[PDB]
Design a protein around this ligand. Structure first.
Ligand code: SAH
Ligand code: SAH
Ligand code: TYR
Ligand code: TYR
Lengths: 216, 216
């Protein structure tokens, strides 16, 4: 039932209710020509409005998952599914054949449309859609590999054997929520080295190892 | 004298003179709060003004080199220099230690500042600067490896031996200008496979092979 890549705690959400009246948000609403509740949170635009938010260090960074998805979906290997788990626990499925906008502003608009319409389609074919399941459900039947600095050292030919779920954080700061780790069930923690790497770099390195083994 | 990565024909330029009076450009100038001549060409904003441009299929795509630079500079391996050759033949040197903005709009602003001021600095240290040389000069003393689909099949341990210049196009469509190829001098053409891949994917794959050999 195949492998999957799952981006965890992706920094992807609409502007939270309680900051929608802030001047920085109202100003962006005017510039964008739509209501605050429809706009994706982006700390390059909304920073001054975000002071009161919980876990703020994780929030307002849709650029991270944008770039990771672009690279991953550019792979010529088509034997995996792609999911995005958001900071708020929502599950988005991305059809392996989806061509995402390469321009960040166009990506943001597409994500806004996704949050509004709940699915993006090519006629009868679904390209991107929220699923009414949790993180625990998309890792069913797959060996979960959680990439974290504190993890262990393993041979990739062994790691990327059968059906795997490659799980990489897509947020800029902090550690995984305890809830996220509980949802993963059984998992193996895998480290690439003694330093904190970016989501994009980890995606790149893991994709390369994955293709080495599996394309093969 | 070390290896280098060179992004070729990067789609990075200010709005050309002859389209500065177009309504789409004047509208963006108002939104940005500065003169057309200072604004980076971006076909997600300026498409309708670009109809009369030569080699238009290559132009207005700074997102491509943005993402490739982010990934490359995220590498933990510090034994290489980084250059960007633009569509107009300009040479930009990027200090290996530079942290580029991850947000595309902030990157665009930094590139606009670079074109205006000609250098970006951390006090006395240069982070990014135009160099008064040509493409032929930055590949002096290095084995040029030009990544193209029509190239040959080689072992990477042999390819990435001594001082190399890894050259990857950073434009969306078309083929290299003949002038660009002439500037490279002696070079080996290297193919990754029988398909056209994105700049980001090629950067990722080559970086991974480079690190395998050299980090080692
Ligand atoms: N050394 C490493 N080995 C394996 N994965 C790593 C890694 N460094 C970062 N990652 C992965 O890259 C993601 C983005 S970094 C997220 C913030 C980070 N926890 C600090 O502190 C992480 O969530 C993790 O999935
Ligand atoms: N199969 C392949 N093998 C090696 N490099 C490739 C490749 N496919 C694309 N590239 C590299 O990726 C860059 C971006 S693609 C640029 C447009 C492309 N010439 C079409 O047609 C190219 O300029 C080249 O440097
Ligand atoms: N690439 C590292 C692997 C590693 C991973 C985590 C560590 O804590 C240490 C080492 C090496 O070969 O050394
Ligand atoms: N990765 C390819 C290499 C290749 C490159 C260019 C080609 O035209 C063909 C094959 C392989 O192992 O088959």
């Amino acid at each position: 039932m195949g492998s999957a890549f799952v981006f965890l705690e992706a920094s992807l959400e609409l502007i939270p209710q309680k900051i929608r009246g802030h001047p920085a948000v109202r100003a962006d609403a005017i510039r964008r020509g739509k209501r605050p509740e429809k706009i994706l949170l982006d700390d390059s635009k909304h920073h001054t409005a975000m002071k009161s938010l919980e876990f703020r260090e994780k929030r307002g960074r849709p650029d991270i998952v944008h770039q990771c998805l672009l690279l991953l979906l550019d792979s010529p290997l088509r034997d995996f599914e792609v999911y995005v788990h958001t900071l708020n626990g929502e599950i988005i499925w991305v059809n392996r054949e989806t061509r995402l906008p390469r321009n960040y502003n166009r990506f943001v608009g597409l994500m806004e449309k996704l949050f509004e319409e709940r699915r993006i389609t090519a006629g009868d074919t679904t390209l991107i859609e929220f699923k009414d399941v949790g993180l625990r459900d998309i890792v069913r039947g797959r060996d979960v590999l959680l990439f974290r600095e504190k993890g262990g050292r393993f041979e990739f030919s062994e790691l990327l054997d059968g059906d795997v779920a490659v799980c990489i954080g897509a947020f800029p700061h902090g550690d995984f929520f305890e809830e996220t780790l509980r949802e993963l069930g059984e998992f193996k923690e895998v480290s690439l080295g003694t330093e904190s790497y970016t989501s994009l770099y980890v995606t790149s390195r893991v994709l390369c190892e994955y293709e080495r083994v599996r394309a093969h």
